[PDB]
mmCIF file of all heavy atoms in Angstrom:
data_model
loop_
_atom_site.group_PDB
_atom_site.id
_atom_site.type_symbol
_atom_site.label_atom_id
_atom_site.label_comp_id
_atom_site.label_asym_id
_atom_site.label_seq_id
_atom_site.Cartn_x
_atom_site.Cartn_y
_atom_site.Cartn_z
ATOM 1 N N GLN A 1 -6.355 10.702 -11.330
ATOM 2 C CA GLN A 1 -7.673 11.064 -11.828
ATOM 3 C C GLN A 1 -7.523 11.474 -13.283
ATOM 4 O O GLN A 1 -7.263 12.645 -13.572
ATOM 5 C CB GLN A 1 -8.279 12.196 -11.005
ATOM 6 C CG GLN A 1 -9.778 12.099 -10.833
ATOM 7 C CD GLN A 1 -10.531 12.442 -12.092
ATOM 8 O OE1 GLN A 1 -10.174 13.378 -12.802
ATOM 9 N NE2 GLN A 1 -11.583 11.686 -12.380
ATOM 10 N N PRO A 2 -7.685 10.542 -14.222
ATOM 11 C CA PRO A 2 -7.250 10.807 -15.598
ATOM 12 C C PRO A 2 -7.970 11.957 -16.259
ATOM 13 O O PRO A 2 -7.395 12.614 -17.133
ATOM 14 C CB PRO A 2 -7.541 9.482 -16.306
ATOM 15 C CG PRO A 2 -8.672 8.921 -15.553
ATOM 16 C CD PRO A 2 -8.434 9.282 -14.122
ATOM 17 N N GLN A 3 -9.214 12.227 -15.874
ATOM 18 C CA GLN A 3 -9.995 13.231 -16.581
ATOM 19 C C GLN A 3 -9.511 14.635 -16.256
ATOM 20 O O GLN A 3 -9.041 15.362 -17.136
ATOM 21 C CB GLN A 3 -11.468 13.070 -16.231
ATOM 22 C CG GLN A 3 -11.866 11.638 -16.021
ATOM 23 C CD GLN A 3 -13.245 11.367 -16.535
ATOM 24 O OE1 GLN A 3 -13.792 12.163 -17.289
ATOM 25 N NE2 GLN A 3 -13.824 10.243 -16.133
ATOM 26 N N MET A 4 -9.607 15.035 -14.988
ATOM 27 C CA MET A 4 -9.184 16.377 -14.614
ATOM 28 C C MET A 4 -7.696 16.583 -14.828
ATOM 29 O O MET A 4 -7.262 17.719 -15.030
ATOM 30 C CB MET A 4 -9.542 16.658 -13.158
ATOM 31 C CG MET A 4 -11.005 16.466 -12.834
ATOM 32 S SD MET A 4 -11.403 16.959 -11.150
ATOM 33 C CE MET A 4 -11.082 18.716 -11.235
ATOM 34 N N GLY A 5 -6.910 15.514 -14.803
ATOM 35 C CA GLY A 5 -5.481 15.624 -14.980
ATOM 36 C C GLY A 5 -4.697 15.884 -13.720
ATOM 37 O O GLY A 5 -3.550 16.330 -13.807
ATOM 38 N N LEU A 6 -5.271 15.621 -12.551
ATOM 39 C CA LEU A 6 -4.600 15.855 -11.284
ATOM 40 C C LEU A 6 -4.676 14.606 -10.422
ATOM 41 O O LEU A 6 -5.578 13.782 -10.577
ATOM 42 C CB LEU A 6 -5.214 17.028 -10.519
ATOM 43 C CG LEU A 6 -4.958 18.437 -11.041
ATOM 44 C CD1 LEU A 6 -3.511 18.576 -11.488
ATOM 45 C CD2 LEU A 6 -5.922 18.794 -12.156
ATOM 46 N N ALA A 7 -3.721 14.479 -9.507
ATOM 47 C CA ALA A 7 -3.750 13.385 -8.551
ATOM 48 C C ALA A 7 -4.930 13.546 -7.608
ATOM 49 O O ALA A 7 -5.280 14.659 -7.211
ATOM 50 C CB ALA A 7 -2.451 13.339 -7.755
ATOM 51 N N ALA A 8 -5.543 12.424 -7.242
ATOM 52 C CA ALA A 8 -6.747 12.410 -6.416
ATOM 53 C C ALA A 8 -6.448 11.661 -5.125
ATOM 54 O O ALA A 8 -6.720 10.468 -5.003
ATOM 55 C CB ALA A 8 -7.890 11.782 -7.167
ATOM 56 N N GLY A 9 -5.900 12.372 -4.154
ATOM 57 C CA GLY A 9 -5.689 11.786 -2.852
ATOM 58 C C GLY A 9 -4.505 10.838 -2.806
ATOM 59 O O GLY A 9 -3.696 10.742 -3.722
ATOM 60 N N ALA A 10 -4.423 10.128 -1.687
ATOM 61 C CA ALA A 10 -3.351 9.172 -1.461
ATOM 62 C C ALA A 10 -3.803 8.187 -0.397
ATOM 63 O O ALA A 10 -4.853 8.351 0.225
ATOM 64 C CB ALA A 10 -2.058 9.868 -1.042
ATOM 65 N N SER A 11 -2.988 7.158 -0.199
ATOM 66 C CA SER A 11 -3.275 6.109 0.766
ATOM 67 C C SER A 11 -2.057 5.211 0.860
ATOM 68 O O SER A 11 -1.326 5.038 -0.115
ATOM 69 C CB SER A 11 -4.502 5.293 0.362
ATOM 70 O OG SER A 11 -4.328 4.751 -0.933
ATOM 71 N N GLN A 12 -1.853 4.638 2.038
ATOM 72 C CA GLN A 12 -0.700 3.780 2.244
ATOM 73 C C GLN A 12 -0.744 2.609 1.276
ATOM 74 O O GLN A 12 -1.817 2.149 0.882
ATOM 75 C CB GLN A 12 -0.672 3.277 3.683
ATOM 76 C CG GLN A 12 -0.776 4.383 4.699
ATOM 77 C CD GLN A 12 0.386 4.393 5.653
ATOM 78 O OE1 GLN A 12 1.035 3.375 5.863
ATOM 79 N NE2 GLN A 12 0.661 5.549 6.240
ATOM 80 N N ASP A 13 0.429 2.138 0.878
ATOM 81 C CA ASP A 13 0.513 1.015 -0.048
ATOM 82 C C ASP A 13 0.074 -0.238 0.687
ATOM 83 O O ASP A 13 0.871 -0.898 1.352
ATOM 84 C CB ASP A 13 1.929 0.874 -0.588
ATOM 85 C CG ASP A 13 2.089 -0.323 -1.491
ATOM 86 O OD1 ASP A 13 2.318 -1.435 -0.979
ATOM 87 O OD2 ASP A 13 1.967 -0.155 -2.721
ATOM 88 N N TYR A 14 -1.208 -0.568 0.576
ATOM 89 C CA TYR A 14 -1.785 -1.685 1.305
ATOM 90 C C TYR A 14 -1.953 -2.923 0.440
ATOM 91 O O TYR A 14 -2.569 -3.895 0.882
ATOM 92 C CB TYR A 14 -3.125 -1.279 1.907
ATOM 93 C CG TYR A 14 -4.222 -1.083 0.893
ATOM 94 C CD1 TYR A 14 -5.171 -2.065 0.679
ATOM 95 C CD2 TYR A 14 -4.319 0.088 0.163
ATOM 96 C CE1 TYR A 14 -6.176 -1.891 -0.235
ATOM 97 C CE2 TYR A 14 -5.322 0.270 -0.752
ATOM 98 C CZ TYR A 14 -6.247 -0.724 -0.947
ATOM 99 O OH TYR A 14 -7.251 -0.551 -1.863
ATOM 100 N N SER A 15 -1.430 -2.910 -0.782
ATOM 101 C CA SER A 15 -1.486 -4.082 -1.646
ATOM 102 C C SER A 15 -0.252 -4.957 -1.471
ATOM 103 O O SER A 15 -0.360 -6.142 -1.143
ATOM 104 C CB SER A 15 -1.631 -3.652 -3.109
ATOM 105 O OG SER A 15 -2.934 -3.921 -3.592
ATOM 106 N N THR A 16 0.926 -4.381 -1.673
ATOM 107 C CA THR A 16 2.181 -5.122 -1.614
ATOM 108 C C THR A 16 2.735 -5.038 -0.198
ATOM 109 O O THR A 16 3.327 -4.031 0.191
ATOM 110 C CB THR A 16 3.170 -4.565 -2.624
ATOM 111 O OG1 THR A 16 3.480 -3.210 -2.279
ATOM 112 C CG2 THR A 16 2.561 -4.593 -4.008
ATOM 113 N N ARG A 17 2.551 -6.105 0.573
ATOM 114 C CA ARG A 17 3.071 -6.186 1.927
ATOM 115 C C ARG A 17 3.489 -7.618 2.216
ATOM 116 O O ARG A 17 2.860 -8.566 1.747
ATOM 117 C CB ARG A 17 2.037 -5.731 2.957
ATOM 118 C CG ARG A 17 1.925 -4.236 3.115
ATOM 119 C CD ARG A 17 0.864 -3.909 4.140
ATOM 120 N NE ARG A 17 0.864 -2.499 4.507
ATOM 121 C CZ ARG A 17 -0.020 -1.951 5.331
ATOM 122 N NH1 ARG A 17 -0.975 -2.695 5.870
ATOM 123 N NH2 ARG A 17 0.048 -0.659 5.615
ATOM 124 N N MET A 18 4.551 -7.766 2.998
ATOM 125 C CA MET A 18 5.089 -9.072 3.347
ATOM 126 C C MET A 18 4.537 -9.481 4.704
ATOM 127 O O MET A 18 4.709 -8.758 5.689
ATOM 128 C CB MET A 18 6.614 -9.039 3.367
ATOM 129 C CG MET A 18 7.208 -8.235 2.235
ATOM 130 S SD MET A 18 8.998 -8.339 2.157
ATOM 131 C CE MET A 18 9.194 -10.077 1.801
ATOM 132 N N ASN A 19 3.874 -10.634 4.753
ATOM 133 C CA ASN A 19 3.204 -11.100 5.967
ATOM 134 C C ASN A 19 4.227 -11.754 6.894
ATOM 135 O O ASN A 19 4.238 -12.963 7.123
ATOM 136 C CB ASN A 19 2.078 -12.058 5.607
ATOM 137 C CG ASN A 19 1.271 -12.485 6.809
ATOM 138 O OD1 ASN A 19 1.561 -13.500 7.434
ATOM 139 N ND2 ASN A 19 0.243 -11.716 7.134
ATOM 140 N N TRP A 20 5.098 -10.923 7.442
ATOM 141 C CA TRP A 20 6.157 -11.443 8.301
ATOM 142 C C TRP A 20 5.674 -11.907 9.625
ATOM 143 O O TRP A 20 6.537 -12.262 10.425
ATOM 144 C CB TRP A 20 7.240 -10.388 8.518
ATOM 145 C CG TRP A 20 6.739 -9.106 9.093
ATOM 146 C CD1 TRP A 20 6.436 -7.976 8.405
ATOM 147 C CD2 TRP A 20 6.490 -8.813 10.472
ATOM 148 N NE1 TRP A 20 6.010 -6.999 9.265
ATOM 149 C CE2 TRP A 20 6.037 -7.489 10.540
ATOM 150 C CE3 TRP A 20 6.610 -9.542 11.654
ATOM 151 C CZ2 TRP A 20 5.697 -6.881 11.739
ATOM 152 C CZ3 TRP A 20 6.273 -8.935 12.841
ATOM 153 C CH2 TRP A 20 5.824 -7.620 12.875
ATOM 154 N N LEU A 21 4.378 -11.955 9.927
ATOM 155 C CA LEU A 21 3.941 -12.242 11.287
ATOM 156 C C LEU A 21 4.300 -13.646 11.744
ATOM 157 O O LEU A 21 4.220 -13.921 12.944
ATOM 158 C CB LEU A 21 2.434 -12.037 11.408
ATOM 159 C CG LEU A 21 1.938 -11.668 12.804
ATOM 160 C CD1 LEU A 21 2.377 -10.264 13.157
ATOM 161 C CD2 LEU A 21 0.433 -11.803 12.905
ATOM 162 N N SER A 22 4.691 -14.535 10.836
ATOM 163 C CA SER A 22 5.088 -15.887 11.199
ATOM 164 C C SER A 22 6.594 -16.095 11.133
ATOM 165 O O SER A 22 7.053 -17.234 11.227
ATOM 166 C CB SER A 22 4.387 -16.904 10.301
ATOM 167 O OG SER A 22 4.777 -16.730 8.952
ATOM 168 N N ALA A 23 7.370 -15.032 10.977
ATOM 169 C CA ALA A 23 8.817 -15.130 10.877
ATOM 170 C C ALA A 23 9.471 -14.899 12.230
ATOM 171 O O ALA A 23 8.891 -14.300 13.136
ATOM 172 C CB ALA A 23 9.360 -14.126 9.863
ATOM 173 N N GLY A 24 10.698 -15.388 12.357
ATOM 174 C CA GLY A 24 11.459 -15.219 13.570
ATOM 175 C C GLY A 24 12.094 -13.850 13.626
ATOM 176 O O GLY A 24 11.953 -13.044 12.705
ATOM 177 N N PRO A 25 12.802 -13.552 14.713
ATOM 178 C CA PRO A 25 13.462 -12.244 14.807
ATOM 179 C C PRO A 25 14.551 -12.045 13.776
ATOM 180 O O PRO A 25 14.924 -10.901 13.495
ATOM 181 C CB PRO A 25 14.024 -12.244 16.233
ATOM 182 C CG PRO A 25 14.220 -13.678 16.548
ATOM 183 C CD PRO A 25 13.095 -14.405 15.873
ATOM 184 N N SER A 26 15.088 -13.126 13.209
ATOM 185 C CA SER A 26 16.149 -12.988 12.220
ATOM 186 C C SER A 26 15.601 -12.511 10.883
ATOM 187 O O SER A 26 16.196 -11.646 10.232
ATOM 188 C CB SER A 26 16.889 -14.314 12.054
ATOM 189 O OG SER A 26 17.938 -14.188 11.113
#
């Protein structure tokens, strides 16, 4: 939050994810 100068909450990193749902067990 650039204005107040403090962090504003959080959330899981939902942008960078590997779509392994089509990969094998290896």
Side-chain angles (χ1 to χ4, degrees):
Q1 215 287 319
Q3 325 217 15
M4 305 185 65
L6 288 319
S11 56
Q12 308 237 336
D13 177 275
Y14 70 101
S15 252
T16 63
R17 279 179 170 176
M18 319 186 64
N19 185 268
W20 57 262
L21 207 70
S22 63
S26 181

